[PDB]
């Protein structure tokens, strides 16, 4: 249906959603605000990034092939959101004093995703099952912003590296990620990354 | 053995709602006590985190709306329940004595959106979303029950929420579970505060 995304003028908790829409060849309108995002799909109004991701998962079939996979998609997404919460708290609340210890902790925070990949067709497909889910887009965005926070952080992790390279190369997603609409938006809204 | 196992602390906490849901749906499960959680097993599937569990049971027991639109509305209601639950948890463990007066004065404004939801859905006479029970109902019921303990009479400002609690609490299987030692003899939280 007709989509509208309302958010602050940053990537933030909106980036994964946008990546998903772009890659899935959906059209949407952006409305700027100077819990979000607010999302409109016909007469339906949604708030909160994870609730929006799940909705798009159901409607566009990005939620696993069955009930069991759906639950696994949720658990992976929970793990993405736990790290993202720690990121947001670092960025907006303790960047200076906190960063050194955050980056120290970071390889331990990434390993579980590497292991998860290692248990799903040799890490050659997606984070859950044989087809992309909303968890993949969210995990990709998380990995990308961590590479800015800590360049080289995926170097020790070959499945996660190939995974980012592979998903980033899907042609609609690639075009989106190279575009100014993505590249020229700040990651967060306080100058920090 | 039961196909379900719940693994948690000896508290109600984040497990209360799913236990109520399982009891109300006439399901059998095993409790394992531990001195990420709760952990939930359903056959060889292992889940963590109360909301992911609730959603799993919503999908399998048909408690996730009648269609995709309702499913998303269930999720939003659930988000609301979890936001207030997160503030409650903050109060309980972090600032109970100095914070309680403030939290209770703010409580009306936190509760009002749920009352409004009910008033927009068949005059508050069925469930929080649609005409069938969902996992958000169980989660909201628990949040309301524990706020009645924190702030007795807090629902006197909310006629629809009051009747809703009375109505859901009277569902036979759930009623028996809520009166049972299994529920009554666990404390609401882990730090003695409520
Ligand atoms: As956090
Ligand atoms: As909170």
Give a verbal description of the structure.
The complex is a heterodimer of chains A (193) and B (194). Chain A is 58% helix and 9% strand. With 193 residues, chain A is an alpha+beta fold. Chain A folds into two domains: 1-62 and 171-191, Glutaredoxin; 63-170, Up-down Bundle (Glutathione S-transferase Yfyf (Class Pi), Chain A, domain 2). A four-stranded mixed beta sheet of chain A has the order 2-1-3-4, covered by helices on one side. In chain A, a hairpin with a 2-residue loop joins strand 3 (38-41) and strand 4. In chain A, helix 1 (15-23) packs across helix 5 and helix 1 packs across helix 7. The radius of gyration of chain A is 16 Å and the shape is globular. Chain A starts with a strand and ends in a 10-residue tail after the last helix. Chain B has 194 residues and is α+β, with helices and mostly antiparallel strands. Chain B has two domains: 1-63 and 172-192, Glutaredoxin; 64-171, Glutathione S-transferase Yfyf (Class Pi), Chain A, domain 2, CATH 1.20.1050.10. Chain B has helices at residues 16-24, 50-60, 68-94, 96-120, 135-150, 159-168, 172-179, 181-184, and strands at 4-8, 29-33, 39-42, 45-48. Chain B has a four-stranded mixed beta sheet with strand order 2-1-3-4, with helices on one face. In chain B, helix 1 (16-24) crosses helix 5 and helix 1 packs across helix 7. The longest helix of chain B has 27 residues, at 68-94. The radius of gyration of chain B is 16 Å and the shape is globular. Chain B starts with a strand and ends in a 10-residue tail after the last helix. The interface between A and B is medium-sized, with 17 and 17 residues. Chain B: The modification N6-succinyllysine is found at residues 87, 100. Chain B: The modification Phosphothreonine is found at residue 46. Chain B: Belongs to the GST superfamily. Pi family. Chain B: It comes from Homo sapiens (Human). Chain B: It holds the Pfam family GST_C_3.
């Amino acid at each position: 249906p007709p989509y509208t995304v309302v958010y602050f003028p940053v990537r933030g908790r909106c980036a994964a959603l946008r990546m998903l829409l772009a890659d899935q060849g959906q059209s949407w309108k952006e409305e700027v605000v100077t819990q979000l995002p607010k999302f409109q799909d016909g007469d339906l109004t949604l708030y909160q990034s994870n609730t929006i991701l799940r909705h798009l998962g159901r409607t566009l079939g990005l939620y696993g092939k069955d009930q069991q996979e759906a639950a696994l998609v949720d658990m992976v997404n929970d793990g993405v959101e736990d790290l993202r919460c720690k990121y947001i708290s670092l960025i907006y609340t303790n960047y200076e004093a906190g960063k050194d210890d955050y980056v120290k902790a970071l390889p331990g925070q990434l390993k579980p995703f590497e292991t998860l990949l290692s248990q799903n067709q040799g890490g050659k497909t997606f984070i859950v099952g044989d087809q992309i889910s909303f968890a993949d887009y969210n995990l990709l965005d998380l990995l990308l912003i961590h590479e800015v926070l800590a360049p080289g952080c995926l170097d020790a992790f070959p499945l996660l590296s190939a995974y980012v390279g592979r998903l980033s190369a899907r042609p609609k997603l690639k075009a989106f990620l190279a575009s100014p609409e993505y590249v020229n938006l700040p990651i967060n809204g306080n100058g920090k990354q």
